[PDB]
Amino acid sequence: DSKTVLKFLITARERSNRTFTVLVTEGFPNNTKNAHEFAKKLAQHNIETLVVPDSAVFALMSRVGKVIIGTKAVFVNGGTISSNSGVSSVCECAREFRTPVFAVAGLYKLSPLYPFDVEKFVEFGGSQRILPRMDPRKRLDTVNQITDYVPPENIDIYITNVGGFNPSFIYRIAWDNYKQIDVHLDKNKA
Amino acid sequence: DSKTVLKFLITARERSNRTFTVLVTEGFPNNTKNAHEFAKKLAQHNIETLVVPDSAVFALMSRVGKVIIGTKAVFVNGGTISSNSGVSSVCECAREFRTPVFAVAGLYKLSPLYPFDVEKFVEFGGSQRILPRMDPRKRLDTVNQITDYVPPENIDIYITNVGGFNPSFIYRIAWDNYKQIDVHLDKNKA
Amino acid sequence: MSEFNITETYLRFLEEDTEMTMPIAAIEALVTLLRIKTPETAAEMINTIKSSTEELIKSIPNSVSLRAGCDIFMRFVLRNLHLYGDWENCKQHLIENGQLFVSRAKKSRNKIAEIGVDFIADDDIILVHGYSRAVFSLLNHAANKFIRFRCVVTESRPSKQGNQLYTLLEQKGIPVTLIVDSAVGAVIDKVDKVFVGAEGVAESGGIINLVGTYSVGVLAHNARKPFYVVTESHKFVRMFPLSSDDLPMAGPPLDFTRRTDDLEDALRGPTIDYTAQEYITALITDLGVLTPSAVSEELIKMWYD
Amino acid sequence: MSEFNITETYLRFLEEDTEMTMPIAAIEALVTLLRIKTPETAAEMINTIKSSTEELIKSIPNSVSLRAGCDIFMRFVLRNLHLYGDWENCKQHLIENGQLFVSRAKKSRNKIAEIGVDFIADDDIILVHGYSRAVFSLLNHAANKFIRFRCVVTESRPSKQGNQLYTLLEQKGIPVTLIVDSAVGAVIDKVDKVFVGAEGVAESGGIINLVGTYSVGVLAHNARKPFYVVTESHKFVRMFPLSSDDLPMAGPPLDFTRRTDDLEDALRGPTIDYTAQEYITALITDLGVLTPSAVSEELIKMWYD
């Protein structure tokens, strides 16, 4: 669910005529709507693609030595607010194999705020599409999650419109765009 | 300088018809006698081979995800007494990329002794072929080394005639072949 | 007629209150140095403090938080002499600034308690180490907010400070244990967050405070917990190692001289450690929360010239 | 007419000499238990020691080196009752073995000093922690061989033992420093080798001795130094955790009860840590040098049945 790399890997095959493949997993059960949509349009531009399930992504991680992650927002630590589901632990599993971890982000996707609590930005979803039976008498509990967060130690680069950058450099781009007063954006200046 | 993998990768291409390549570095300036001999006979059996220099082996280590090391002897720790030169630090550089590190060893290449000092088994060479000028008046000093030792944490498997084994299991094969008296092989039983 | 060097001004008010700390006490002594002794000329004023700061380093050689105070006071009076007032107003224009830090650096710690609120969250077991008083004022704000947490105090050996912090906040009313510093590695898995405080920040981000903040820092990185550190915006020094070896107290950290009669043997090793950028993950200033790379640049932004 | 339980046999000879240690003192008490009290029947003999070992665990619950001694004495008398002598000779056939360990386990430590020679090599700065007396007898052999090295003693806090070891070998004539346990992380880079000793070995290879041997062990693995440990062949116990939490002394390692009048506050945390196989790299037995995987198998070779 990143329209950047959906558009980018077209011209990454088209102008630069490099041939390769992309493994693609699902954001189960939420980006699997778009995960089947993603590689199909890449099958039109025929970049040797194949869909992996979410459980298999460790077992093929030894082969692949490069991962790109299309994030949603990014904070001052270099810990970014990613897309919907499944992407944090595989970003962790990538980091354990000493594999470089890529990310793309527009300059307007920056945010001058700090991730104080991880859980105040990790938004969840619904009990509907994670099991549809809805038992009222047995009635177990189950957890969805439609936001993943990664630490900046698990990320390596920020492919932006103004260059590639360190995970720790993110303040200097941000404080060239934001000021120390309105980061505490509240009428009570306590 | 391992006649095992010199003979093994013939039939690893011949019977099993797997196609691949091998990078090969030199044991400078000592196994570079045989390093140019090694890939040439593999060029006869044409396994896509290419010779790398010793300095370049970090820069291509990100591509390769499997290394094999033909050792000379092996002790009870799983730290093995390797061949001549250059092989320990690249075994370390392999381990840092979370790359599996292979080794081959015959059962008679086992040794029931312990590596008390690493330096009492690391044998050096000569000042001749590491610089040939032999200045008596400037007269700097220089170091050769014709034995490398690796810890068992940098090794993963022991491809032997009786199976593949842990780096820490090496005692049980050895004590099924050796006894506690003649490991202190000396007339003074002090 | 004072001389402002040792105790004729400085060590007077260090017995006045143990709320002022060591570097701003030197800042309080340095701003009152040129205030009374104002020798009506820009030349010997800075030559007075260059005499006075270098004997103050010579006074106590092993309290290098004072050296950070000796560092930035020169950085204060340099740009304060800038704005180009030809020393005519800059006598008054410095002393009308004057009492800034006894009104502003005294309110470092409550401003730390303004913005250090949302680190100690709901039910965080907190590992503290050493009397870094900005932590306690952050913990003072935590008890005054009635936010829910617990606390764990280590040792501070040989500097004894961990025995104070247990007595300091039990009367405040927080469930707390004092643990030995030896038992960090078997307990840190249950521990979630960890707070320390440096006597000074080095060029890569330095923890130049106590004996084993680097020991508990390298534990927390393998425990993979956010190793926070609490300080303020006047705790910066240029003094920067390459290893974990700073200037020691008097000798190398591996002495092998013998015990003459009854000399102290726990006090043979160092008392100040070092931690680089790798093991911290965030820090607090009066400017705000600060990443360990921005603490390098702000320590270099007005430091190269 | 004795009863062999608490002090009517056992705590007599623990004031005789501080050269015998705790588990073989229990072994000395257990072999003399059935020696005098030999109730001419194989049934109640082992039912006597099952009464006697379980009250001995009940006697001192927090000296689990004794529990290793309580463990392997049953492992001694089991196979000693094996060879199938129908208890006819096996009364005498056990006691003709009898005084084995007061002749053999007493010479554990010199046999450690026979084969632990070629670890402390030429110019090795040695990190020791806690009075594990097999280390000192290895260091006794090192001084008697006149091999060249140095020594560094840590704390043992709160168990105080590091102050003894500094006094114990300075009179022997070794250049040595006592360091605080807080200053390990800033000094360990100069340190090359490190020696400790467990009160008992767990199933994966356990260090169940002191407060922070796991702390100095996890330091040494990031320092990437060979973390050796010195023990002997009678220091094995089945007691085996999954975390670094063993049985504690009396309560959980995070207490939050308060100080009533003047109660001790350093003694709130644990006194025994745990280290798994990952952070050790070699150990010494009377059988020989031993890898941390073989110490698992020999602790399981006669332990499953």
Author numbering:
A (entry chain E), B (entry chain F): 192 to 381
C (entry chain A), D (entry chain B): 1 to 305
The authors write:
Eukaryotic protein synthesis typically begins with a specialised initiator methionyl transfer RNA (Met-tRNAi) that is delivered to ribosomes by the translation factor eIF2 as part of a larger preinitiation complex (PIC) with multiple other translation initiation factors. Only by re-engaging with GTP can eIF2 participate in further rounds of Met-tRNAi binding and protein synthesis initiation. This requires the action of eIF2B. eIF2B first removes eIF57 and then acts as a guanine nucleotide exchange factor (GEF) to activate eIF2 and facilitate Met-tRNAi interaction and rebinding of eIF53. Here we have used single-particle electron cryomicroscopy (cryoEM) to resolve the structures of eIF2αP/eIF2B and eIF2/eIF2B complexes from Saccharomyces cerevisiae to an average resolution of 3.9 and 4.6 Å, respectively.
Hence, the eIF2B subunit structural models are highly similar, with only very minor rearrangements. Specifically, R53 is reoriented in the unphosphorylated complex. In addition, there are minor movements associated with R55 and R64, the latter moves away from S52. Overall, the weaker density in the S52 phospho-loop of the eIF2/eIF2B complex prevents us defining precisely the positions of the side chains. This likely points to enhanced flexibility of this region of eIF2α in the absence of the phosphate group.
